[PDB]
Short mmCIF file of C-alpha atoms in Angstrom, two decimals:
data_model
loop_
_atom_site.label_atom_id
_atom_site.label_comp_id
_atom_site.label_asym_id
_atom_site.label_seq_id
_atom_site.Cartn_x
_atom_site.Cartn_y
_atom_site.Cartn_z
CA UNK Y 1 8.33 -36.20 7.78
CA UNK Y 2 6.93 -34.55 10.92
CA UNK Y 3 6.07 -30.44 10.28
CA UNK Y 4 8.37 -27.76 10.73
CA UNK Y 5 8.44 -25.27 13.39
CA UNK Y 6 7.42 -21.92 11.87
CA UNK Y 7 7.40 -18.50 13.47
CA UNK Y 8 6.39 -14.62 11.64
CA UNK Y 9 6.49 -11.54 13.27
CA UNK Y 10 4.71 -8.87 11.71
CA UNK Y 11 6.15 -5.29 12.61
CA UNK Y 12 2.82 -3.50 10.98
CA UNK Y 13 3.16 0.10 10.13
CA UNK Y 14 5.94 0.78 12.58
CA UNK Y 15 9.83 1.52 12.44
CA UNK Y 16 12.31 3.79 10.76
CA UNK Y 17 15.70 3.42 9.14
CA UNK Y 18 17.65 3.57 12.74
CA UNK Y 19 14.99 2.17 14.52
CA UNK Y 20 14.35 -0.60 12.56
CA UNK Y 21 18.44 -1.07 11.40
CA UNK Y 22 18.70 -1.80 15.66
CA UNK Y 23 16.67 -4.77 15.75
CA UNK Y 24 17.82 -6.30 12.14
CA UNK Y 25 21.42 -6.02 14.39
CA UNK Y 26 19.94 -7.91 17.02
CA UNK Y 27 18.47 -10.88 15.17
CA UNK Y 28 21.53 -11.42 13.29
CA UNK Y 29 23.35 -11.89 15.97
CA UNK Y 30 21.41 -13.83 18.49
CA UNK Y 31 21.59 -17.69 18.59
CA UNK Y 32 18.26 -19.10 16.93
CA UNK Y 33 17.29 -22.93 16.77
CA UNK Y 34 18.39 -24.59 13.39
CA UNK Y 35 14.53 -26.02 13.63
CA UNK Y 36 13.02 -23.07 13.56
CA UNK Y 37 11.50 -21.69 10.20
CA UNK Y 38 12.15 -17.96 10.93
CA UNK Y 39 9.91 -14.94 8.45
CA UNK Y 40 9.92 -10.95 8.81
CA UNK Y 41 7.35 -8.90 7.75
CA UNK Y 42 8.21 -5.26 6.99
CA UNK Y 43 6.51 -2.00 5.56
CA UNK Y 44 6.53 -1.76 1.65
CA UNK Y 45 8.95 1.17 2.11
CA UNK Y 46 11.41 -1.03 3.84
CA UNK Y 47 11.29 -4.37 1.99
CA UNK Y 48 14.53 -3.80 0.16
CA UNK Y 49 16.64 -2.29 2.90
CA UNK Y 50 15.40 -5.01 4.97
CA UNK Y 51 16.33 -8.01 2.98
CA UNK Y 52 20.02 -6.26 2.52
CA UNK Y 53 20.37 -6.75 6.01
CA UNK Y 54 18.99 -9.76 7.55
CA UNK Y 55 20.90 -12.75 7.57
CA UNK Y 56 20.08 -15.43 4.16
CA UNK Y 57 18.62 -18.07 6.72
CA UNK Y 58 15.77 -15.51 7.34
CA UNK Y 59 13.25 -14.94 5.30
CA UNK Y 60 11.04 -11.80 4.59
CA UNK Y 61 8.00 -10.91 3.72
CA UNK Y 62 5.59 -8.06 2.29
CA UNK Y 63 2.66 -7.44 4.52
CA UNK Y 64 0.15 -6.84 1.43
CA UNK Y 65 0.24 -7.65 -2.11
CA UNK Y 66 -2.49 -7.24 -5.54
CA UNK Y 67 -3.42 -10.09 -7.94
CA UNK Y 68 -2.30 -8.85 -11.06
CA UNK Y 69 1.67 -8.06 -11.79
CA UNK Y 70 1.22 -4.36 -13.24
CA UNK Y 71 -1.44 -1.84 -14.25
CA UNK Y 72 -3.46 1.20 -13.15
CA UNK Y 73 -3.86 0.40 -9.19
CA UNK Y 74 -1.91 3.82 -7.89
CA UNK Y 75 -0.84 2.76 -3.99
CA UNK Y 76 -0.23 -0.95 -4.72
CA UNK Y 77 2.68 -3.70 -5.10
CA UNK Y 78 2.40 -6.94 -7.10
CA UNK Y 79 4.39 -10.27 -6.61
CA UNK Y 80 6.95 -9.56 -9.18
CA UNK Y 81 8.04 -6.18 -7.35
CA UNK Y 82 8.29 -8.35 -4.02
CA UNK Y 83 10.76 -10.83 -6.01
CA UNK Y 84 12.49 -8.58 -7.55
CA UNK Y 85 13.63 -7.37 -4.49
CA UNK Y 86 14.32 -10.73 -3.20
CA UNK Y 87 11.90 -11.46 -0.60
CA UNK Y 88 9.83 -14.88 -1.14
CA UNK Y 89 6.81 -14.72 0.53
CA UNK Y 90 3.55 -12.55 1.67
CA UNK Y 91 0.90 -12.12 4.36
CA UNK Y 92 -2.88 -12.12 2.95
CA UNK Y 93 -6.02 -11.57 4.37
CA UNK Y 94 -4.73 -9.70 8.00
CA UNK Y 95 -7.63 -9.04 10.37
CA UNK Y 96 -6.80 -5.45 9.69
CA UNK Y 97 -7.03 -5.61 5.93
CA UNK Y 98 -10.41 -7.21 5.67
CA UNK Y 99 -11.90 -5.28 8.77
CA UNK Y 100 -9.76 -1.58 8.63
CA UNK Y 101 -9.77 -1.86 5.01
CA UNK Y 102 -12.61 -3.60 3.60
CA UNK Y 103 -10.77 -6.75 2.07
CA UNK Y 104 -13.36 -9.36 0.41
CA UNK Y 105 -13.13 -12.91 0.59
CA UNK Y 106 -13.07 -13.14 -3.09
CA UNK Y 107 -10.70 -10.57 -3.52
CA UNK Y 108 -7.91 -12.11 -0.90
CA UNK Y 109 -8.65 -15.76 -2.79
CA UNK Y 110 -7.76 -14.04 -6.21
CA UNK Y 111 -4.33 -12.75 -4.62
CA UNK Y 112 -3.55 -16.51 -3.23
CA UNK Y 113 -3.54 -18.22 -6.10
CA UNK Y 114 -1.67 -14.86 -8.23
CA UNK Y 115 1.08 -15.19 -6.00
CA UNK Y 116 1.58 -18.74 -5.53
CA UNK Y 117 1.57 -18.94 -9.77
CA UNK Y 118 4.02 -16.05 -9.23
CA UNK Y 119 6.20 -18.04 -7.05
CA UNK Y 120 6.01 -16.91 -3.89
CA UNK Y 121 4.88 -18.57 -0.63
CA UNK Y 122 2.04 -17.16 1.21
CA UNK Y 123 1.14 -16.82 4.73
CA UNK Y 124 -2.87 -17.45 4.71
CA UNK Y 125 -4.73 -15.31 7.51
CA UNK Y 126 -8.14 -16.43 8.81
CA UNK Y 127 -9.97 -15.41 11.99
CA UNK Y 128 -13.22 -14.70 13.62
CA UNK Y 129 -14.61 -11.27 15.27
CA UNK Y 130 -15.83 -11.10 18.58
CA UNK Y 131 -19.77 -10.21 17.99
CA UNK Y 132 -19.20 -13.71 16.08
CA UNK Y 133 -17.29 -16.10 18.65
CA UNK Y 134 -20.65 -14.62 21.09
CA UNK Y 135 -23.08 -16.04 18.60
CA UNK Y 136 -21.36 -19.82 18.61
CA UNK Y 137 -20.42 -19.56 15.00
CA UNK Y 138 -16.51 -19.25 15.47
CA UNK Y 139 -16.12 -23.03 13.19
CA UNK Y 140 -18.76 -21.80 10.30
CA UNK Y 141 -16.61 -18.91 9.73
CA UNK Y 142 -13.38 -19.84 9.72
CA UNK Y 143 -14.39 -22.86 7.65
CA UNK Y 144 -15.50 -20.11 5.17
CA UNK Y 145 -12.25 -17.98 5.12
CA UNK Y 146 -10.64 -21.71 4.80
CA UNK Y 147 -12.83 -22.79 1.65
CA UNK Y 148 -11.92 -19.46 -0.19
CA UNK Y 149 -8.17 -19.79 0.04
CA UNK Y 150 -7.97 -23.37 -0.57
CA UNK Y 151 -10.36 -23.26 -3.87
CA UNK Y 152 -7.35 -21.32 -4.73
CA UNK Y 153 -4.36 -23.62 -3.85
CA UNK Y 154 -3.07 -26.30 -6.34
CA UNK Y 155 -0.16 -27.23 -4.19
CA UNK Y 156 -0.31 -26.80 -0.35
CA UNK Y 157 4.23 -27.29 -0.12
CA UNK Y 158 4.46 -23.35 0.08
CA UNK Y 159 1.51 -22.40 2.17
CA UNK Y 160 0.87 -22.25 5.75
CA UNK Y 161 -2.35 -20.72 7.30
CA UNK Y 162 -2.55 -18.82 10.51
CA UNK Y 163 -5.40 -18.34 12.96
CA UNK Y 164 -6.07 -14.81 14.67
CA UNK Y 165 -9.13 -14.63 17.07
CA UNK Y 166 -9.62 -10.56 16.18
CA UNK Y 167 -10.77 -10.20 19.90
CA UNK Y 176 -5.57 -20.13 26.42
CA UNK Y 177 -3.66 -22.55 24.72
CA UNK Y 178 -6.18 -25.31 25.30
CA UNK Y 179 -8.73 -23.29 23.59
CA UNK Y 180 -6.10 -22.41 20.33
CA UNK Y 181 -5.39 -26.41 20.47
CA UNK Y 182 -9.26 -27.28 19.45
CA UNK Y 183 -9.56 -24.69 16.72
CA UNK Y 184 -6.44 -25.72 14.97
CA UNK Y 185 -7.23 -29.68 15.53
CA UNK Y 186 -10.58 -29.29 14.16
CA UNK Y 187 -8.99 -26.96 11.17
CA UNK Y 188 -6.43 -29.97 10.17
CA UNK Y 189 -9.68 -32.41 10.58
CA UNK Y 190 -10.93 -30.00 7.60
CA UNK Y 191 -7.76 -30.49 5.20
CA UNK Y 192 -8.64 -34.52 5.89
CA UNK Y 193 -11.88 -34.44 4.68
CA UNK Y 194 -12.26 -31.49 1.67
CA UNK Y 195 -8.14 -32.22 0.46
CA UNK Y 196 -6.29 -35.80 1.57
CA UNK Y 197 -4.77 -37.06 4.37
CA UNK Y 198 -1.24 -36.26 3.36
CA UNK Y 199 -2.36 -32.76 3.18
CA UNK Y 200 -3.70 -32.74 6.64
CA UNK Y 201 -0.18 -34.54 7.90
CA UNK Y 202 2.13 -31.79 6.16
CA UNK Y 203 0.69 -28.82 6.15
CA UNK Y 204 1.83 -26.04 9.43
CA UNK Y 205 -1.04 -24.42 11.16
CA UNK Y 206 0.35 -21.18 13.31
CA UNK Y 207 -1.28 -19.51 16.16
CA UNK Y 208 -1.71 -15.38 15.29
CA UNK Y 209 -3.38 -14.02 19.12
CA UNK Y 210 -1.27 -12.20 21.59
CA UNK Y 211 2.04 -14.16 21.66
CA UNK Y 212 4.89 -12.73 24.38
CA UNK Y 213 7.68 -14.34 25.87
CA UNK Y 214 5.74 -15.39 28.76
CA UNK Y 215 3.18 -17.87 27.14
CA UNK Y 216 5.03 -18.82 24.16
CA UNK Y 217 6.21 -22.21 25.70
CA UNK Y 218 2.89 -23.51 26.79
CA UNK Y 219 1.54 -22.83 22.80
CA UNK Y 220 4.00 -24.58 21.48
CA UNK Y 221 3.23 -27.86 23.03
CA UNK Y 222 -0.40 -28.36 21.68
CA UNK Y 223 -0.42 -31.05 19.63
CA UNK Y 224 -1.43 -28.90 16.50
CA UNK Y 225 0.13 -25.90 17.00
CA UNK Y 226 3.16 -25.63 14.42
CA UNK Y 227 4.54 -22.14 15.20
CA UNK Y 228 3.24 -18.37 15.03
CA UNK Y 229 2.57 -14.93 13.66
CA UNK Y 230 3.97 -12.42 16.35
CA UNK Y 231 2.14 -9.14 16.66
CA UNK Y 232 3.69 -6.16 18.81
CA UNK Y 233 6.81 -8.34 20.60
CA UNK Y 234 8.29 -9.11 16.92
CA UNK Y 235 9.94 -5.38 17.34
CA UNK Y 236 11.11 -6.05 20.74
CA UNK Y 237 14.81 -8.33 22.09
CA UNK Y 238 12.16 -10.52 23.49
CA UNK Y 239 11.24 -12.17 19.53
CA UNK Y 240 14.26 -14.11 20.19
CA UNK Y 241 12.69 -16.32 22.51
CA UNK Y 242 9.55 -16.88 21.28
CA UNK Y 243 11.61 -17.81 17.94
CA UNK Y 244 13.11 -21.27 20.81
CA UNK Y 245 10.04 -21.80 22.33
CA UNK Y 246 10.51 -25.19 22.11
CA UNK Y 247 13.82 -26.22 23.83
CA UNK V 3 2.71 30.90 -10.14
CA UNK V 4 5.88 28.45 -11.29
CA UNK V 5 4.88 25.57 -13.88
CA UNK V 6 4.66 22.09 -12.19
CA UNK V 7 4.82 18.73 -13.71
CA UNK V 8 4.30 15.26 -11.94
CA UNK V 9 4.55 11.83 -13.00
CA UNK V 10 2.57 9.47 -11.89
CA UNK V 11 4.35 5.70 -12.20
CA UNK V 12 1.23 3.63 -10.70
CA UNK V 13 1.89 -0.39 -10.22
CA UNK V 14 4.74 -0.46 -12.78
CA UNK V 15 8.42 -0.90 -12.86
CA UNK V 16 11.72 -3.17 -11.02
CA UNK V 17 14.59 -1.77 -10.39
CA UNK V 18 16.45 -2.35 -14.10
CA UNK V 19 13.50 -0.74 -16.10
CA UNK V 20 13.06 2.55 -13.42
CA UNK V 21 17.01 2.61 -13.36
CA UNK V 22 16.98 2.95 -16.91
CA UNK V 23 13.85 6.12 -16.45
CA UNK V 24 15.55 8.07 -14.07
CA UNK V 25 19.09 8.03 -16.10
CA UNK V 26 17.17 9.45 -19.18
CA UNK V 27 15.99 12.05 -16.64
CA UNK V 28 18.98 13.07 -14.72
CA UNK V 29 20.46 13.73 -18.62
CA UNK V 30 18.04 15.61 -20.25
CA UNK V 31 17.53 19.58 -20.78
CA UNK V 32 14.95 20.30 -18.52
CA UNK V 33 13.20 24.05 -18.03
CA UNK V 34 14.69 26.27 -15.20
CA UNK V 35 11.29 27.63 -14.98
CA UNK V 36 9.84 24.15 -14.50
CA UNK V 37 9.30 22.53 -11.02
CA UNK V 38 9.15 18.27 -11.59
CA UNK V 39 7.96 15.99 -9.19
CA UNK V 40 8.29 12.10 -9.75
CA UNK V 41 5.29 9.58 -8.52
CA UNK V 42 7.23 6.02 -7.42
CA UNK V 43 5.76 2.42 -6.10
CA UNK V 44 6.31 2.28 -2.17
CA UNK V 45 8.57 -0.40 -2.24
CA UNK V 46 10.78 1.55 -4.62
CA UNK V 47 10.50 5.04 -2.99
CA UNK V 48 14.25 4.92 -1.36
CA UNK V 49 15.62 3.57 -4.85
CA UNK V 50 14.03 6.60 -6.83
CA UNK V 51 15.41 9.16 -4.45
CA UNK V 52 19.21 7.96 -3.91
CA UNK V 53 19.26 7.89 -7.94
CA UNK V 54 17.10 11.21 -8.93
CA UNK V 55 18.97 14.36 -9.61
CA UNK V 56 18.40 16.68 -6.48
CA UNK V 57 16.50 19.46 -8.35
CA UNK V 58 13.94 16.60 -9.19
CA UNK V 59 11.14 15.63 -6.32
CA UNK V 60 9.89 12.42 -5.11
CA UNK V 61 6.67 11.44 -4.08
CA UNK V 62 5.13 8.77 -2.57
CA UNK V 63 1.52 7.43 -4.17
CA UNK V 64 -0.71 7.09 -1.09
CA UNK V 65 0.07 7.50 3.06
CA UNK V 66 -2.41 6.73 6.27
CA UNK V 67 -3.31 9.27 8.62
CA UNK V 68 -0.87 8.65 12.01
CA UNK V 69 3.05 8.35 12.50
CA UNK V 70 2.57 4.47 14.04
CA UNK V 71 0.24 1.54 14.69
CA UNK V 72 -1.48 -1.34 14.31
CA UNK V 73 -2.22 -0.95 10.21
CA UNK V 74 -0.40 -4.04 8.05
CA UNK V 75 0.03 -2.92 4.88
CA UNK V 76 0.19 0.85 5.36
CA UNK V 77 3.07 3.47 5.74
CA UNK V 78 3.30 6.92 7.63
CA UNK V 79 4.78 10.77 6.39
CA UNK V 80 7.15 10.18 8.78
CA UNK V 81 8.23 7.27 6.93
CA UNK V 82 7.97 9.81 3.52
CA UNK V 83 10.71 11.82 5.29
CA UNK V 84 12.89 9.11 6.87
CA UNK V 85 13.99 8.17 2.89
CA UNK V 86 14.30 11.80 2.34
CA UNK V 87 11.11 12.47 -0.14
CA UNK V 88 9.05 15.49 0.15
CA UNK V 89 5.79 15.16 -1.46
CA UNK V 90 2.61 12.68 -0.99
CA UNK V 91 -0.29 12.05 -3.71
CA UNK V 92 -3.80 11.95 -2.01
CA UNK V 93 -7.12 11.15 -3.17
CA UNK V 94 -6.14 9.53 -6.39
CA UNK V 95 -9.42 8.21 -8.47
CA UNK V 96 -8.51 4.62 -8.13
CA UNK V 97 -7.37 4.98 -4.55
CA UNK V 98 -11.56 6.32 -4.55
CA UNK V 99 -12.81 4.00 -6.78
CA UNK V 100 -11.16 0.53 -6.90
CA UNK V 101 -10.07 0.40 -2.98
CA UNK V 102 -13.15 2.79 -1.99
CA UNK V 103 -11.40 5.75 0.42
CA UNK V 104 -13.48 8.21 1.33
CA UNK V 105 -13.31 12.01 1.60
CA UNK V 106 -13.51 12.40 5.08
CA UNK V 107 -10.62 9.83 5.36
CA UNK V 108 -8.69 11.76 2.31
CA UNK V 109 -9.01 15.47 4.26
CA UNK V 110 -7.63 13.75 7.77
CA UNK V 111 -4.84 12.33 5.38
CA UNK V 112 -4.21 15.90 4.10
CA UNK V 113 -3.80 17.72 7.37
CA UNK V 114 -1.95 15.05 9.15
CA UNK V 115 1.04 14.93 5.83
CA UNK V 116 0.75 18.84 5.64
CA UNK V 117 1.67 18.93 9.91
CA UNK V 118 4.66 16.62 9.59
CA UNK V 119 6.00 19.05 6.82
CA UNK V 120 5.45 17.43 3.40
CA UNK V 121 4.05 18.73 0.40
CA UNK V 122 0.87 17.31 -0.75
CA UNK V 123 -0.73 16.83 -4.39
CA UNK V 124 -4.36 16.68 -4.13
CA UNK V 125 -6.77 15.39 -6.70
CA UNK V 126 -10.18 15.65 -7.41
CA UNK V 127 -12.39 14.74 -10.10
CA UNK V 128 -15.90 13.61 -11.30
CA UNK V 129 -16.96 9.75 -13.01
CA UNK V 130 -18.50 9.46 -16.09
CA UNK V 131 -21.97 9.33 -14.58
CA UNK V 132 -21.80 12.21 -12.89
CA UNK V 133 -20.37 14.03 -15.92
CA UNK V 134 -24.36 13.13 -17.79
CA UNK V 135 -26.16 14.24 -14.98
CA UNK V 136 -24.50 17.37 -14.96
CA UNK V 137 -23.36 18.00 -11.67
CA UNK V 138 -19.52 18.52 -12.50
CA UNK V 139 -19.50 21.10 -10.67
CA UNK V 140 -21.07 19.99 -7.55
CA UNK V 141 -18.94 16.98 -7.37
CA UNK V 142 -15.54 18.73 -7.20
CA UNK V 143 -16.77 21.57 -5.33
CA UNK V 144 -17.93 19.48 -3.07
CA UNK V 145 -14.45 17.05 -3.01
CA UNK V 146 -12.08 20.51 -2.71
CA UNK V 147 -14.15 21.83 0.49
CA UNK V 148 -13.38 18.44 1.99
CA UNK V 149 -9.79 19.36 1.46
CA UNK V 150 -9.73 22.93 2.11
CA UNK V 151 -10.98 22.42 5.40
CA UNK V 152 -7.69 20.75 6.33
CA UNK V 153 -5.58 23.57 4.77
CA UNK V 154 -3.52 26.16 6.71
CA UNK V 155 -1.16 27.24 4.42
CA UNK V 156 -1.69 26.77 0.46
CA UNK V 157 2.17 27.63 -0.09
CA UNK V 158 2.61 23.49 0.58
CA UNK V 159 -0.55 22.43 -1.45
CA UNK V 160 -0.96 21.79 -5.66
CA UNK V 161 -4.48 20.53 -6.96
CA UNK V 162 -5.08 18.39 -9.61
CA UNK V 163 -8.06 17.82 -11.56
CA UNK V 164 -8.72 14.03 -13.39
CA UNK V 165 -11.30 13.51 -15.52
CA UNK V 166 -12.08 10.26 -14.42
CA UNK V 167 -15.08 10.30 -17.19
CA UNK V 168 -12.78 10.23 -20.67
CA UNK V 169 -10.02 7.96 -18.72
CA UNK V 172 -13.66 5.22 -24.31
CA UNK V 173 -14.12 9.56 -24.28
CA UNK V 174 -12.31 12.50 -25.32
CA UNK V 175 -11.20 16.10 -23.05
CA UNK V 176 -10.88 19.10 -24.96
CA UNK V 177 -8.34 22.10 -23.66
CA UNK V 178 -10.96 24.65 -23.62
CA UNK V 179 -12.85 22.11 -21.32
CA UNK V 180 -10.00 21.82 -19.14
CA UNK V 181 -9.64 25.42 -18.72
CA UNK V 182 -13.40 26.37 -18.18
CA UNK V 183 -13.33 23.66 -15.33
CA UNK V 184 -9.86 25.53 -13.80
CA UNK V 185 -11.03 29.04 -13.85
CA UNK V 186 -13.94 27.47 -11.79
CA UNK V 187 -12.00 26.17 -9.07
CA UNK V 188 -10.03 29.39 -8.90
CA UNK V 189 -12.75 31.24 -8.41
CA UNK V 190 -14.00 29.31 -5.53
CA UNK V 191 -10.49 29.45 -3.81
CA UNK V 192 -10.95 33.48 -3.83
CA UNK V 193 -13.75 33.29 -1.89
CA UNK V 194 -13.69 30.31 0.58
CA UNK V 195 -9.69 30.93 1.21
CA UNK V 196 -8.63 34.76 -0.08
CA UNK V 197 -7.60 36.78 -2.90
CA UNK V 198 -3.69 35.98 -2.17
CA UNK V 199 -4.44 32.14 -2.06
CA UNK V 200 -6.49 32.37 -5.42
CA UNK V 201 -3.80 33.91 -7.51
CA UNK V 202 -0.82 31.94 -5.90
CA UNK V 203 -1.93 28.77 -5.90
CA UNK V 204 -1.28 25.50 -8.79
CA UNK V 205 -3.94 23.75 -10.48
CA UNK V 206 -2.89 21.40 -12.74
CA UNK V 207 -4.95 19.07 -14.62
CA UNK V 208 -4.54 15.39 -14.61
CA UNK V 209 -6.80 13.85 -17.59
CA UNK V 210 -4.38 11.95 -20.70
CA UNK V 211 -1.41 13.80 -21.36
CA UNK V 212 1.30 13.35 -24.06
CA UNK V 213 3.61 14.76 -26.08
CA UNK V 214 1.28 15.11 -28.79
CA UNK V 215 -1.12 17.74 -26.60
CA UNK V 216 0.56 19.40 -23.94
CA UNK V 217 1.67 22.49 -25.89
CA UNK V 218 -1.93 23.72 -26.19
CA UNK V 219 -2.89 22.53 -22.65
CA UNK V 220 0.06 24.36 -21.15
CA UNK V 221 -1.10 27.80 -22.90
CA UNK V 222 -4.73 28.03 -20.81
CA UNK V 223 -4.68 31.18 -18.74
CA UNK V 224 -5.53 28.92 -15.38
CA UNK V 225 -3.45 25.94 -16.41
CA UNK V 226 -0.61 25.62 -14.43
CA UNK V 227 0.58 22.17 -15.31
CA UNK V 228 0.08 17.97 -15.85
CA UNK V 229 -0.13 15.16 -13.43
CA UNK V 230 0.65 12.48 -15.92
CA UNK V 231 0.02 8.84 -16.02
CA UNK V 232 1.47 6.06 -18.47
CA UNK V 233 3.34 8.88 -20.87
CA UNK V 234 5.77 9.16 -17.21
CA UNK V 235 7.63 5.33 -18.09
CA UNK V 236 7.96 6.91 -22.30
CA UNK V 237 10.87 8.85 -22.68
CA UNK V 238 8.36 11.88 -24.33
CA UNK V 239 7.99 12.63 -20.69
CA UNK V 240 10.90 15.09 -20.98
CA UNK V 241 8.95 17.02 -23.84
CA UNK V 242 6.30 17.21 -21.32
CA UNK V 243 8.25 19.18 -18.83
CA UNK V 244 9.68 21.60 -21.86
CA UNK V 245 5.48 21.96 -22.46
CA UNK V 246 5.91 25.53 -22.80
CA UNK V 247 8.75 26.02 -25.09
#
């Protein structure tokens, strides 16, 4: 009935074989909370290697993904590679993709509901720049980033959406209430009630406890500590 | 200047139906005189390598331009090397086209792969609109300076021309060829004589079974980067172009 504790970590474009062989060790054998939904998020190159290691209870996911499941789009991956290989979920719509790379609001709404239809779950990204949280505008645009992913969900059981400012936990708390007063109004109220809303700034061991205890927060997306011992206990944050 | 054929797999494949590709492969009679180079999906890159015949390359379809960082979604040479590959594509047309790279970002991509000590296939190649206004010419001139600039040594370096134009169109061999000899004949002047004659060009517009024999026999054709005939088993006749 109440939501699910959910933490990501997202290891970017980092890692080798060894390297990255170290720290799949190290999560497989440290004790984790049994209420803790735990997801890894590894380089296309190491998505298969990856899921032959981890431990079944963990999950893994691509970090990128295109809306169509084959054709001529040299340099991409579609859902059906990404099962195939036996990881169930993806991240779309990373600050990075739409600001590094150009990513279109349109274009990341197209690969929501694609992989959802595919059978996948999806981690939904949204977030606002800094030039716009100066200009007061921080709830117009997320609402907007919101609106285009959920014109594209049918079923909200396999999505969760997390917030990244681009640029304190009492200022996360207010954005993620007033993003669940959203679902209420433009979906249902059982929506609102289910659905996990994680926190994507700069999360370390250090302020991962006081996060956690906002009545809205329902977990993270870890940055630049997922590929450190320290993931561990941001993954029990809450006991 | 040995013959070189790659194959370029694009967003296609799981691991049954490239299994099944690379067995065909590893048991066919293949030229001595012919140097092959296979084009896999990223996520399938280790895969292709631990089942491929050793005499057979592997390359990856795109890279970024650092070891390390703070890009989701992308993957390093050093990566490229880690699973034991030895070659990179860069500059594809849909890589320019559909996900909009440009060529400044293409030539840092080529000098970064070529200093970590891959081999790197580079392509260039003008759109249809281009191709009515004429300016062929000035387009991949223009696209292979962008490149050269970032060269040291050409020992490590093929280029490959796609006619984006024709791929509801049509590309002649003696098209293909007048387009080659160009290119050579800027490489003798903006590189050196020794570069010029030692150096691959192979051409990348639709390739099959069915035309590669007469493509293969152009005096500054040196080989085929070849797109949806690489998941047919008339790939192998391909390689054997010149027999």
């Amino acid at each position: 009935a109440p939501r699910k504790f959910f933490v990501g970590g997202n290891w970017k474009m980092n890692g080798d074989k060894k390297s990255l062989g170290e720290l799949i060790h190290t999560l497989n054998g440290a004790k984790l909370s049994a209420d803790t939904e735990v997801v890894c998020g590894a380089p296309s190159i190491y998505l298969d290697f990856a899921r032959q290691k981890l431990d079944a209870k963990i999950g893994v996911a691509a970090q990128n993904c295109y809306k169509v499941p084959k054709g001529a789009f040299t340099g991409e991956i579609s859902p059906a590679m990404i099962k195939d290989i036996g990881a169930a979920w993806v991240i779309l719509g990373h600050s990075e993709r739409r600001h590094v790379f150009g990513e279109s609001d349109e274009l990341i709404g197209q690969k929501v509901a694609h992989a959802l239809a595919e059978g996948l779950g999806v981690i939904a990204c949204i977030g606002e720049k800094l030039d716009e949280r100066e200009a007061g505008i921080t709830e117009k645009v997320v609402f907007e980033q919101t609106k285009a992913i959920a014109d594209n969900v049918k079923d909200w059981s396999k999505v969760v959406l997390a917030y990244e400012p681009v640029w304190t936990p009492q200022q996360a708390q207010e954005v993620h209430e007033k993003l669940r007063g959203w679902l209420k109004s433009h979906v249902s109220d059982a929506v609102a009630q289910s659905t996990r809303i994680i926190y994507g700034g700069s999360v370390t061991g250090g302020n991962c406890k006081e996060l956690a205890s906002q009545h809205d927060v329902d977990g993270f997306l870890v940055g630049g500590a997922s590929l450190k011992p320290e993931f561990v206990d941001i993954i029990n944050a809450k006991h």
